Design a protein around this ligand. Structure first.
Ligand code: CL
Length: 111
């Protein structure tokens, strides 16, 4: 085993189950388009993970348009061992009566 591992999750890993170690990190890396008012919202057990870093960054290419899309990166560090579900929804904050355009679900076992 390593000192620690960083596990990268993207849209493509929807419904994945990840087994990680106590001292590992999860990095969720998603594309996003802030110019539209949409953003990813994350739901996770706050007793089990700490938000180590949350970033939105403008992406270089394809230019294309040079600045679109953007990248959302959410890093989570285990606080406790256990089994968790992380859910993300891509939606508009103040929009009423609508479901997220896209939803992601990950199962994470911290052993
Ligand atoms: Cl976002």
């Amino acid at each position: 085993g390593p000192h620690m591992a960083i596990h990268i999750l993207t849209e493509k890993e929807d419904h994945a189950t990840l087994h990680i170690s106590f001292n590992d990190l999860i990095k969720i890396q998603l594309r996003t388009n802030p110019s539209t008012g949409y953003a990813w919202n994350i739901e996770y057990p706050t007793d089990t993970f700490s938000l180590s870093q949350d970033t939105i960054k403008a992406e270089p290419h394809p230019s294309g348009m040079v600045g679109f899309p953007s990248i959302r990166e959410i890093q989570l560090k285990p606080l406790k061992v256990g089994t968790t579900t992380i859910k993300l929804g891509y939606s508009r904050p103040w929009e009423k009566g609508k479901e997220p355009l896209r939803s992601l679900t990950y199962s994470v076992v911290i052993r």
